[PDB]
């Protein structure tokens, strides 16, 4: 496709008028080829804020903080989670900003990225991950992660509910695509940046083949082992084996969109808070039908409801096992037609 052939991460700056319709805007960014990178950044208008202040969240409970223990060498690592007892944002912030766990001194991102890949196996940090909740005020109607109102609402597992992530320096998310190969939206509420790596959906099978070659025991035990979210592969290792990828830094007040079958990984620069959920478009339905799921082991959605409503003509063929549709990763969502 002639739209974003380079498959690079695109950044969008919608106006207040453009921003109001979430689904229409996702269709627009696809028309521009954003989905080819597997990840896109959306900077909201300056006037828009999801909450007036974050000064009242000190006693918010993180029910399951996880100590992230990383094992490995030469750019290949396995991350093990150790669940710790519940803690408040106040206690978490104290640990995150402490001498033991704070961000190192650095000039450029390249320097901090080097410190991360050099030290990720030392001094395990605590990630205040998967907190059920939202930091959005009730009246916020634009890009409200708690209520995006996409076709995924036809489901109601709990993949439509928002989650909070309290990060600290060196906390990481391993290589993975979304459950059922869905889209995701991530908003960084406040704090230090979050760095991301992405592999374009058209090259995802190459990452999987690499990952299978490196962890053959894990591959034998589960076809979809990358869904366990424990595998960390450095950009140098990707470059060495010709896996195309891109990187981007998300700063406080910016949105990241992940696209169906877009593999992503990354880390937190320091104390911060992000809000995340999954969503869908008509384009996702085929990805949902073809997704390879964790067999050992997990989030599974019955596609029946989506095929009946959006592909009635293919329902009989698909239930009989005769729907041999091949996904073209470069094609935009049908809703994008108005922009094409
Ligand atoms: O910054 C991040 N921290 C943790 N997780 C993340 C993530 N994902 C978590 C899940 C599991 C959800 N249950 C899926 N994606 N994606 C993107 C970013 C993050
Ligand atoms: Cl705070
Ligand atoms: Zn994700
Ligand atoms: Zn598994």
UniProtKB/Swiss-Prot annotation:
Positions contributing to Zn(2+) binding: 222, 228, 294, 296
Q: What is the effect of changing residue 158 to A?
A: Abolishes histone demethylase activity
**Single Gene Ontology BP annotation:** negative regulation of autophagy
Q: How is it modified after translation?
A: Ubiquitinated by RNF8 and RNF168 following DNA damage, leading to its degradation. Degradation promotes accessibility of H4K20me2 mark for DNA repair protein TP53BP1, which is then recruited. Also ubiquitinated by the SCF(FBXO22) complex; leading to proteasomal degradation.
According to the record, mutating residue 133 to A results in: Abolishes histone demethylase activity
Where's the JmjC domain? Answer: 137-296
Which residues does the UniProt record annotate as the domain JmjN? 9-51
Q: What is its main location?
A: nucleus
What is the tissue specificity?
Ubiquitous.
Q: Which UniProt keywords apply?
A: Acetylation, Chromatin regulator, Dioxygenase, Host-virus interaction, Iron, Isopeptide bond, Metal-binding, Nucleus, Oxidoreductase, Phosphoprotein, Repeat, Transcription, Transcription regulation, Ubl conjugation, Zinc, Zinc-finger
Domain comment as written in the entry: The 2 Tudor domains recognize and bind methylated histone H3 'Lys-4' residue (H3K4me). Double Tudor domain has an interdigitated structure and the unusual fold is required for its ability to bind methylated histone tails. Trimethylated H3 'Lys-4' (H3K4me3) is bound in a cage of 3 aromatic residues, 2 of which are from the Tudor domain 2, while the binding specificity is determined by side-chain interactions involving residues from the Tudor domain 1. The Tudor domains are also able to bind trimethylated histone H3 'Lys-9' (H3K9me3), di- and trimethylated H4 'Lys-20' (H4K20me2 and H4K20me3).
Q: What does this protein do?
A: Histone demethylase that specifically demethylates 'Lys-9' and 'Lys-36' residues of histone H3, thereby playing a central role in histone code. Does not demethylate histone H3 'Lys-4', H3 'Lys-27' nor H4 'Lys-20'. Demethylates trimethylated H3 'Lys-9' and H3 'Lys-36' residue, while it has no activity on mono- and dimethylated residues. Demethylation of Lys residue generates formaldehyde and succinate. Participates in transcriptional repression of ASCL2 and E2F-responsive promoters via the recruitment of histone deacetylases and NCOR1, respectively.
Q: Can you tell me which family this protein belongs to?
A: Belongs to the JHDM3 histone demethylase family.
Tell me how this protein assembles: Interacts with histone deacetylase proteins HDAC1, HDAC2 and HDAC3. Interacts with RB and NCOR1. Interacts with VRK1. Interacts with FBXO22; this interaction promotes KDM4A ubiquitination.
Annotated protein name in UniProt: Lysine-specific demethylase 4A
């Amino acid at each position: 496709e002639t739209l974003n052939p380079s498959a690079r991460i695109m950044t969008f700056y919608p106006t207040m008028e453009e921003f109001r319709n979430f689904s229409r805007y996702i269709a627009y960014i696809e028309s521009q080829g954003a989905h080819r990178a597997g990840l896109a950044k959306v900077v909201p208008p300056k006037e828009w804020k999801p909450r007036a202040s974050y000064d009242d969240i000190d006693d918010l409970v993180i029910p399951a903080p996880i100590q992230q223990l990383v094992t490995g060498q030469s750019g290949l690592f396995t991350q093990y989670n150790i669940q710790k007892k519940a803690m408040t944002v106040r206690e978490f912030r104290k640990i995150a900003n402490s001498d033991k766990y704070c961000t190192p001194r650095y000039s450029e991102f390249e320097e901090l990225e080097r410190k991360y890949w050099k030290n990720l196996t030392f001094n395990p940090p605590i990630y205040g991950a998967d907190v059920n909740g939202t930091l959005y005020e009730k009246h916020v109607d634009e890009w409200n992660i708690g209520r995006l109102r996409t076709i995924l609402d036809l489901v109601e597992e709990g993949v439509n509910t928002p989650y909070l992530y309290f990060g600290m320096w060196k906390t990481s998310f391993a290589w993975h695509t979304e459950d059922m190969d869905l889209y995701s939206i991530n908003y960084l509420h406040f704090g230090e940046p979050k760095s991301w790596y992405s592999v374009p959906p058209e090259h995802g099978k190459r990452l999987e083949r690499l990952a299978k070659g490196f962890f053959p025991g894990s591959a034998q035990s589960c076809e979809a082992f990358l869904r366990h979210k424990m595998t960390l592969i450095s950009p140098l290792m990707l470059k060495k084996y010709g896996i195309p990828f891109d990187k981007v830094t998300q700063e406080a007040g910016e949105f990241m969109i992940t696209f169906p079958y877009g593999y992503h990984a990354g880390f937190n620069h320091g104390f911060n808070c992000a809000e995340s959920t999954n969503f869908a478009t008509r384009r996702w339905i085929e990805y949902g039908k073809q997704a390879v799921l964790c067999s050992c082991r997990m989030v599974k959605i019955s596609m029946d409801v989506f095929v009946r409503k959006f592909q009635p003509e293919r329902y009989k063929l698909w239930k009989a096992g005769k729907d041999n549709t091949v996904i073209d990763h470069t094609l935009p969502t049908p809703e994008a037609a108005e922009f094409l």
